[PDB]
Design a protein around this ligand. Sequence first.
Ligand SMILES: *[C@@H]1O[C@H](CO)[C@@H](O[C@@H]2O[C@H](CO)[C@@H](O)[C@H](O)[C@H]2NC(C)=O)[C@H](O)[C@H]1NC(C)=O
Ligand SMILES: *[C@@H]1O[C@H](CO)[C@@H](O)[C@H](O)[C@H]1NC(C)=O
Ligand SMILES: [Ca+2]
Ligand SMILES: [Ca+2]
Ligand SMILES: [Ca+2]
Ligand SMILES: [Ca+2]
Ligand SMILES: [Ca+2]
Ligand SMILES: [Ca+2]
Ligand SMILES: [Ca+2]
Length: 147
Amino acid sequence: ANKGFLEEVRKGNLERECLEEPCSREEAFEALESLSATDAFWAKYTACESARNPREKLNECLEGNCAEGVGMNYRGNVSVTRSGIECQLWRSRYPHKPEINSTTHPGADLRENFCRNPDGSITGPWCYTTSPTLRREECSVPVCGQD
Ligand SMILES: *[C@@H]1O[C@H](CO)[C@@H](O[C@@H]2O[C@H](CO)[C@@H](O)[C@H](O)[C@H]2NC(C)=O)[C@H](O)[C@H]1NC(C)=O
Ligand SMILES: *[C@@H]1O[C@H](CO)[C@@H](O)[C@H](O)[C@H]1NC(C)=O
Ligand SMILES: [Ca+2]
Ligand SMILES: [Ca+2]
Ligand SMILES: [Ca+2]
Ligand SMILES: [Ca+2]
Ligand SMILES: [Ca+2]
Ligand SMILES: [Ca+2]
Ligand SMILES: [Ca+2]
């Protein structure tokens, strides 16, 4: 956050500016070393916008081993759909040619074939499936703070 005085004279610091305080994308950018690090952090930050307090809750949301809300923050390793179909690699163009990818959604961490929710689908983290007849399907990932 910018407490309009001389704070913007200091080197950016993610802990001070974006974790202990809410921040704008540009503040995150100023605190990071690349656009790549900035797109990833921003996607995580906005996906956890409402899991801001306490800090332990925010850190769990940002780590992403569980889904918060619709799971846009999810960064775990589940790679199978809820019906048990093995996920297709995001980078593969077979058996489905992805219309969502690294370029369209930078920051979403579309890696290997891990379930992700880059588009905010209301049914949660999903993946393109290796079944030729089922383009995509959601996955089963723990909800943050569940049981
Ligand atoms: C989740 O998946 C990631 C990515 O494959 C695993 O981390 C990688 O593990 C390999 C082998 O241990 C390393 O060569 C890579 O450097 C790791 N990638 C990184 C650092 O992102 C990770 O171990 C997996 N964790 C779980 C929950 O199984
Ligand atoms: C993502 O999809 C676009 C649109 O089809 C395509 O032009 C581009 O090459 C793809 N990029 C990646 C990251 O594969
Ligand atoms: Ca500040
Ligand atoms: Ca600031
Ligand atoms: Ca700054
Ligand atoms: Ca701190
Ligand atoms: Ca402060
Ligand atoms: Ca600034
Ligand atoms: Ca700037």
